[PDB]
Design a protein around this nucleic acid. Structure first.
Ligand SMILES: [Mg+2]
Lengths: 346, 165, 368, 249
DNA sequence: AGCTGGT
RNA sequence: GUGAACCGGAUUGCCGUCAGGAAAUUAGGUGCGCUUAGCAGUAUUCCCCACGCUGUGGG
DNA sequence: ACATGTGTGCTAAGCGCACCTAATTTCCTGACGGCAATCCTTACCAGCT
């Protein structure tokens, strides 16, 4: 019953060639051509060369299809200098290539579910290094997206698939152009006088011989059948770190462990202890292991806050065990003793 | 935000001796003098347990030092790139306008800690032009997120918008 | 076999290089502004250095006919020389032409003055220009020559002018955020007047930065373009080492006499060179302890650690050197004890690198 | 089975790929202009030198490679230069040269590679373990020699920092991680922010194989959690080469 | 005797 | 594998060369921290071995 | 990054400032230098293989 798979063409660069390229100006078209997705199809089966001409192009040449523009990518031109007889003589051959940049597409393939069922297990697992119609243009999205289903008409299938969104505040095309083939509703029907001819229909493959086809423009506004999709997936890293946990339930109980592990005493300037300091801020602590804290008296923990609050805040901590952060701690404690105003709090 | 407003209002409560010792700590971190750290702790600790959103610590320390040095008053709608730019229209475009303009653009490519002296010269020419109001809350929450380029470009476009009018 | 020479130089407030508008050069390395010194300025200052004078043997001139006319007491050949040059391929007084100095002087003088021809005279002058490869400054910096095809003769040809550069000087990237500073100067009118003002109020921009300077010698290329000899090659390598450690770019040094010396040398012998620019992708922000030079050396030594273990090349180890004068600035302050031959001199490292080059000594080679 | 060498590569300021007028080449992605080197340039740079030749079945049955255009993780920043060639012979005035302008860009790149099962076995050359030997050469030969360019005046051969190798068989480039160009926040590096973006994309898509991860002396972890998003946070030269060798066979 | 690099 | 393959835009470069930001300045005048206090005390001193049950080894 | 280690036993209330104030003149650079090629032919002809 699922008669259609929605091919997902999306990458940094892509190009399906137009007809106006025999010489060094090689161009593309503003739609994935029929033999610009059938080449992907033939690569996805793992064959190529002259095998596609028989039983692979006519195996679906009787089958209509439609394409959708998620966003119209702009046309980019890349300089390309073929070296000819250089890595004949050093005469450098010249060229220019056309690239469609940042364009997403959605092709339909409708009519029957046996070939679509064979084709559904052809996009993800079977490969012959599939790309976006150009050999050096990678598909940036899983092509096997948009799972198949029954939607009887071309517009229903082409509009009954959710439309993605990359970031939240992103402009979205409210009109989605649709490229559709010609439907012979009755025998002897003549094409409407707006249907341009596209020459994307191979009858052989190597060397390329071609047939033309009729292409009908069509339109799709968002809202009636197509709609935006859930985005999620935060593209903002900003390295994580918790902070400011007085007590959930596991600070009351975990302060005492190093309080009386060190026998109710300080560690640097040994004396009756009050509080606990934290070293190795890998996690600021909702769940704290008992080999990282440091039960330590009031004045030298105030000196620890001296040294931490000044200069960098960071995630590296003091660790008053290795004697390189010693003179500063004692000096700060000395000015704490000399200059603390208890009546002015803290 | 409902957290930075309390910080600015508590800063406006500070008496002469406290902001004097804050004035003496220009360009100096909050460690080499005990009373400066004590004042900063008193100003900075109690606003985290009452409201869930607080500014960054370095932004708070720098803003406290600059506030003590300059002593403006808090008024909505008086951010830096409006008064800046308003004073740039009162200039000769030939020579002095590029001078003051480059002095302003120096801020857009600096990290939070090193902006004490460029903000000092910007607020010095603001004081020379007799500016009393400065949106300390607005400056603080555009400075605590100064590392994202949208707010920097919005601040610059605010300067452009105030300059063309 | 190719030699890497790395420096970390802190400089006084100076303007060693400017663009057309007069600003110090800047590059956007790692998403932040880094102060830049152009490679060509360093190459030129090392070319004109006071120790290269025994080896300075290249001339980049368009006034070749002036050079011919200078060494002729009474035989005025300056229009004939000009037309010989004008049909050589240069079309005007010409474009810039690179060659050896004394060779072109004497033998272009002898090949130009004789009244034996005008077409073949230009052809042999062009051949003398093209064969002028007996100079190691041309061998280091590199030179091509392209004459016109319009203002020439169909009977005048040009040989292959292929000379590869045996030196890849990198641009000196600052080890931190560039802080470009604006200098305001006036020009005093010596005589007085009514106005009591300046003769010229002007604009100058200066930048104080710790520059990561980076050079690289292709010694194999240095001898494949300096013919079969190696004595001149070793002399040039020693001369560059002395010059680079001893000379500075001749920018606004009369106004900013920043003649400070490189506080770091890293010479490592391998067949795959590396710049420690990624040692300072993170900008170096100083702390209260230590200084900018030590923090930069610390980040550099961290990078040397994970490219000597993570990117280890123990098939060809590092022969990493230093110029730590009596160990003032050690590299391995925490873990990186891989400096195999940390010394505190300059002639010692010169002699050492020419020793791993081959069987040479510093004093014997210094005669070519 | 398919090999995806997702590779990051920072670059010190230097121009590498030049168009007609000499600019660094550019691409369009994520609604911004980003710097670009052409896939032909880097693919020829993988050839034409003997250090990699230590391979004619792989860049010629045609050839066996999918090399993508080097999409910058951030916006393009093209700069310009100004050179003066001196006269060095004293004339009546000073200055003689072309007095032209050059131009350069410093960027952090990304690329994606593809070597399939039969695309490496039918490559063959003469062995069946060659289908592991050549790949094992490749996984660090792709990060062996930066191309070429104006290196004699802009010396830049910065080795890469963070290298992915995946054995997922479905060919998908992770360029959608760089839909938003990477901004810089003071506490992390540009390469570290880009690697965090790559990690953040890695934790996605698995919802709807392994992660073989390279970090030299593991300075860059793929996720700041014990639940590592690659689970193979190791790597040292040919250890990864041999591990891919006995991953394939 | 033809061929190929130059005009 | 496909209007698609396989594919460099390459080499040569000092922006240099002249520059006081100088002339002038009271930081000004007003102010109480202050009302209240034994560092003493036998009738269980928290203990553990430990005495004819208060001497005896210490936490 | 106040709380939590009380240990015979650790108070506390009233009180916290107003206003005049910020100036100008003029001064600001001339010249010299700016790349050539090579990315389809009036195609046969003679140096010589
Ligand atoms: Mg203590």
């Amino acid at each position: 019953p699922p008669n259609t798979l929605f091919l997902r063409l999306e990458g940094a660069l892509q190009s399906w060639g137009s007809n106006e390229a025999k010489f060094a100006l090689r161009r593309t078209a503003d739609a994935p051509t029929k033999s610009g997705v059938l080449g992907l199809l033939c690569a996805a089966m793992g064959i190529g060369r002259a095998e596609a001409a028989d039983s692979w192009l006519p195996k679906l040449a009787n089958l209509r299809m439609g394409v959708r523009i998620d966003r119209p990518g702009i046309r980019w031109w890349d300089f390309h200098t073929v070296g000819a007889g250089q890595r004949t003589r050093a005469e450098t051959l010249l060229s220019r290539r056309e690239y469609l940049a940042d364009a997403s597409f959605l092709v339909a393939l409708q009519g029957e579910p046996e070939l679509v069922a064979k084709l559904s297990a052809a996009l993800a697992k079977p490969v012959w290094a599939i790309y976006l119609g150009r050999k050096s243009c990678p598909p940036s999205r899983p092509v096997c997206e948009h799972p198949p289903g029954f939607y009887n008409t071309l517009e229903e299938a082409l509009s009954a698939v959710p439309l993605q969104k990359r970031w939240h505040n992103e402009p979205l095309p409210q009109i989605l152009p649709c490229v559709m083939d010609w439907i012979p509703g009755y025998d002897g029907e003549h094409a409407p006088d707006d249907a341009e001819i596209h020459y994307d229909l191979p009858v052989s493959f190597q060397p390329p011989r071609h047939l033309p086809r009729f292409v009908i423009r069509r339109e799709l506004v968002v809202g009636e059948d197509v709609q935006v999709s859930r985005e999620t997936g935060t593209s903002v890293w900003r390295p994580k770190g918790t902070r400011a946990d007085y007590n959930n339930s596991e600070y009351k109980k975990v302060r005492a462990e190093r309080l009386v592990m060190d026998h109710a005493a300080c560690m640097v300037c040994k004396a009756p202890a009050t509080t606990v300091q934290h070293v190795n801020y890998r996690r600021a602590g909702g769940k704290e292991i008992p080999e990282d804290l440091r039960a330590l008296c009031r004045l030298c923990a105030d000196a620890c806050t001296m040294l931490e609050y000044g200069s960098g805040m960071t995630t590296n901590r003091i660790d008053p065990c290795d004697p390189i952060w010693r003179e500063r701690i004692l000096a700060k404690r000395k000015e704490i003793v000399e200059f603390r105003s208890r009546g002015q709090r803290f | 935000n409902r957290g930075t407003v309390d910080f600015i209002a508590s800063l406006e409560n500070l008496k002469e001796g406290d902001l004097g010792i804050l004035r003496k700590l220009r360009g100096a971190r909050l460690d080499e003098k005990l009373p400066g750290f004590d004042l900063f702790s008193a100003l900075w600790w109690p606003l985290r347990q009452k409201n869930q959103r607080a500014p960054k610590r370095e932004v708070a320390w720098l803003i406290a030092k600059l506030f003590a040095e300059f002593r403006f008053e808090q008024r909505e709608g008086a951010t830096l790139p409006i008064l800046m730019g308003g004073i740039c229209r009162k200039l000769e475009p030939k020579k002095e306008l590029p001078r003051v303009l480059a002095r302003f653009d120096q801020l857009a490519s600096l990290d939070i800690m090193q902006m004490e002296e460029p903000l000092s010269v910007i607020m010095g020419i603001l004081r020379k032009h007799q500016q009393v109001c400065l949106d300390w809350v607005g400056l603080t929450d555009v400075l605590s997120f100064w590392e994202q380029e949208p707010v920097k470009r919005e601040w610059s476009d605010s300067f452009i918008k105030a300059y063309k009018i | 076999m190719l030699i890497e020479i790395h420096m970390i130089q802190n400089h006084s407030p100076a303007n060693l290089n400017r663009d057309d508008l007069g600003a110090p050069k800047t590059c956007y390395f790692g998403g932040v502004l880094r102060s830049r010194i152009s490679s060509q300025c360093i190459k030129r200052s090392i070319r004109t250095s006071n120790d290269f004078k025994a080896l300075l043997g290249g001339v980049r001139t368009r006034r070749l006919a002036d050079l011919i006319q200078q060494e002729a007491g009474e035989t005025e050949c300056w229009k004939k020389a000009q037309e010989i040059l004008n049909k050589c391929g240069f079309k005007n007084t010409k474009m810039l032409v690179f060659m050896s100095k004394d060779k072109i002087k004497d033998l272009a003088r002898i090949v130009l003055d004789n009244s034996l021809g005008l077409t073949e005279a230009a052809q042999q002058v062009a051949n003398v220009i093209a064969q002028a490869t007996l100079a190691p400054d041309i061998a280091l910096c590199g030179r091509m020559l392209e004459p016109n095809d319009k203002d020439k003769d169909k009977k005048v040809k040009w040989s292959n002018t292929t000379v590869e550069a045996a030196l890849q000087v990198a641009h000196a990237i600052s080890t931190h955020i560039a802080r470009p500073e604006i200098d305001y100067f006036v020009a005093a009118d010596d005589v007085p007047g009514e106005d009591a003002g300046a003769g010229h109020i002007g604009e100058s921009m200066f930048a104080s930065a710790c520059f990561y300077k980076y050079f690289s010698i292709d010694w194999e290329q240095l001898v494949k373009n300096l013919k079969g000899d190696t004595n001149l090659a070793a002399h040039t390598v020693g001369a560059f080492l002395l010059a680079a450690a001893k000379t500075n770019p001749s920018g606004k040094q009369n106004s900013f006499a920043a003649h400070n010396y490189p506080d770091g040398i890293l010479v490592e012998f391998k067949n795959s060179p590396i710049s420690y620019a990624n040692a300072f992708v993170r900008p170096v922000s100083v702390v209260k302890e230590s200084d900018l030079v030590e923090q930069s050396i610390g980040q550099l030594s961290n990078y040397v650690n994970d490219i000597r273990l993570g990117y280890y090349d123990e098939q060809s180890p590092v022969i990493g050197f230093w110029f730590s004068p009596n160990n003032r600035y050690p590299l391995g302050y925490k873990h990186s004890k891989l400096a195999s031959r940390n010394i505190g001199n300059l002639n010692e490292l010169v002699g050492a690198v020419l020793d791993y080059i081959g069987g040479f000594k510093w004093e014997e080679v210094q005669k070519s």
